[PDB]
Every structure is written in structure tokens, then in C-alpha cells.
Amino acid sequence: ETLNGGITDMLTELANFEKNVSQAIHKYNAYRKAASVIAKYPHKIKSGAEAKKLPGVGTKIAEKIDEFLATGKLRKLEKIRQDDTSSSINFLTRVSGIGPSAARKFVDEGIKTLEDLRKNEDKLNHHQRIGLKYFGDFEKRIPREEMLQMQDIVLNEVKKVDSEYIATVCGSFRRGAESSGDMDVLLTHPSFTSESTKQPKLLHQVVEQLQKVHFITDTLSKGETKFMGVCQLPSKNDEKEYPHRRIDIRLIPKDQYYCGVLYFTGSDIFNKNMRAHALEKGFTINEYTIRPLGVTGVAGEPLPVDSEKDIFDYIQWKYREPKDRSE
DNA sequence: CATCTG
DNA sequence: CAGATG
Ligand code: NA
Ligand code: NA
Missing domain, CATH: 3.30.460.10 (Beta Polymerase, domain 2)
Incomplete structure (x- = not known):
């Protein structure tokens, strides 16, 4: 949570870029589980070798952690943060309707800025267009x-x-x-x-x-x-x-x-925890319903619910006012 | 996952 | 319809 921060963060930087710029979903996905694991890891990573030990932990990553731990930076991270192209994608993307896919096309077309965008308002679809119209409003x-x-x-x-x-x-x-x-x-x-x-x-x-x-x-x-x-x-x-x-x-x-x-209320954390206990108390929860768990492994059937009460009730729990639904 | 595009 | 975006 703070022990493996830089590491976990860099990785996320690395993972992010792979997907959004390059198309490396595998790579991307690599940096991901990796940071996820180092994320839970109870000690202070003091070396690549140390890390490598972990699952999802490859040699390349290791390699990386080394240079980072070794020097307060990463060359690759440094190159990317400059690379205007990479940058562009990151930006163009802020625009509602513009995913990465889209981002690449425009860039290779030379649309790189906000102004670029207006000048070529033709090339955008409706969403893409509203997105542009309300860029600020949107971000506010x-x-x-x-x-x-x-x-x-x-x-x-x-x-x-x-x-x-x-x-x-x-x-x-x-x-x-x-x-x-x-x-x-x-x-x-x-x-x-x-x-x-x-x-x-x-x-x-x-x-x-x-x-x-x-x-x-x-x-x-x-x-x-x-x-x-x-x-x-x-x-x-x-x-x-x-x-x-x-x-x-x-x-x-x-x-x-x-x-x-x-x-929809969350948070994600509340959900999980609520979701887990659900499981304890012999149940299931997801977006649309709560179901009695069968023992044979699993099983279903719609538990009838008339309020957020009825749910909790099932899992025999304290009704949580929404404010305290935090974690 | 539901909607849009092309 | 495969594919992109939220
Ligand atoms: Na966007
Ligand atoms: Na395919």
C-alpha cells in the first residue's frame, strides 16, 4: 500500500501505455497482474530477483524493477513521457467518444490537438462531437x-x-x-x-x-x-x-x-465485503439479484426483494445507511 | 453490457 | 455483422 508504491505505479504506467499506444493487450495485461501481486506483497522489494520470485513476475519486469530500484527512474518510462505521439493519444482520449482506437487513427492523420479536432469536426461522430463541444464542462x-x-x-x-x-x-x-x-x-x-x-x-x-x-x-x-x-x-x-x-x-x-x-451505490469495497459475507451467510449477489446458495457447488433461484433492507436481512446484516456504505 | 457505426 | 466506447 506504500511499501511497493513506485514499483506498482511504474508498472501501471508501463501497462497503461502498452494497451493505449501500442496495442499490446498481452503486455498490458502482464504489467497488470504483476503490479497486482507486488501490490499485496507484504515486504519491501529490495531487488528484481526478489520480485521475480513472485508469480506474474518475469525476468523483464524484474529487469525493470532493477533499474528503477537501482536509479530513481526508468529510461523507457522516460522516453514515453516525452514521445509526443504517446502523449497525443493520452489526450485525445480525454474526449468523450474517443477511445484509444480512435485516438491512434486521428493521430496518424495528424489530428493531435483540440484545435486539430475542431478543424476536422467532420471526421468525428455525434458523441465525439458533443464530447468536443463540452470538453471542459465534461471534465469539471x-x-x-x-x-x-x-x-x-x-x-x-x-x-x-x-x-x-x-x-x-x-x-x-x-x-x-x-x-x-x-x-x-x-x-x-x-x-x-x-x-x-x-x-x-x-x-x-x-x-x-x-x-x-x-x-x-x-x-x-x-x-x-x-x-x-x-x-x-x-x-x-x-x-x-x-x-x-x-x-x-x-x-x-x-x-x-x-x-x-x-x-450502483457502492462503493466497490462495500460491495465486495457485502458480497463476501453474502457467500458466508449461504448466498449470492450480483448486479440483479440475491440467490440462496446450493451446496452441490452452487445453485440458484430469485430471492424476493422489496428494499435494500430485504437484501441485507437475508445475509443477516446491519442495514447500512448509504453514507456508511463506504467500505 | 448496451448502443452506435460503418 | 465485428468492433468501439462508456
Ligand atoms: Na474518450
Ligand atoms: Na477477431
């Missing part, structure tokens, strides 16, 4: 002060459309966090479930409303169950308009809400 964190404002609107409109909808703002917003990055709304309707054959409108209906009122501004992507968009808090009294915020709306059968809800 979201303050709970505004978070509550957003929540307010969304929830009110969802109400008007149908009294039977159930919306929920999951995320760290939900775990108390002072600022979030984007807004995740989980949605269900009684009339929707596991077996219940579809009802897209169920999602489309609200989408429309939010745009109606101008909350939603653009569409990133819009399917039958997941909407990816852009929204905005109505600039009050002209002087201070809001930033553009990322927002997702997703439909879920009412029959697997809370699990989702639980799940």
Missing part, C-alpha cells in the same frame, strides 16, 4: 449543491409523467459525496419486470419530458433501457449559466431494482 466535477438541484428536477418531472415510477440517484451522491462526476439515475416502474415483455416507452417517456423542460440537452445514445446524455441546470438570472453535465438514465424491471440500486 459536480458539486452536491447542484447535485441536489438536478435531483430535484428529475424527480419531480418523473413524478408528473407517471406516479408509479421510481427514480433513484445512485452513485457517491447517494453515499454522501461532496462532489460527483456525473449523474446516475436508476429507474423502474411496477409495470416492468423480469418476465414482463418490454415497454421501452417506459424509458422514452421520461426522456422526452426532461428534454421538454430543457433539462436534457443532447443525446449521447438512446436505447430501450439506457439513455446516455447531457443536461443542465437552468441558468437562473443570466450572468451565471451552468456547466454541461453527463447523465444517464436506465430502466430496470421493478423486480431487480434494489439490488441494482444497492449495487
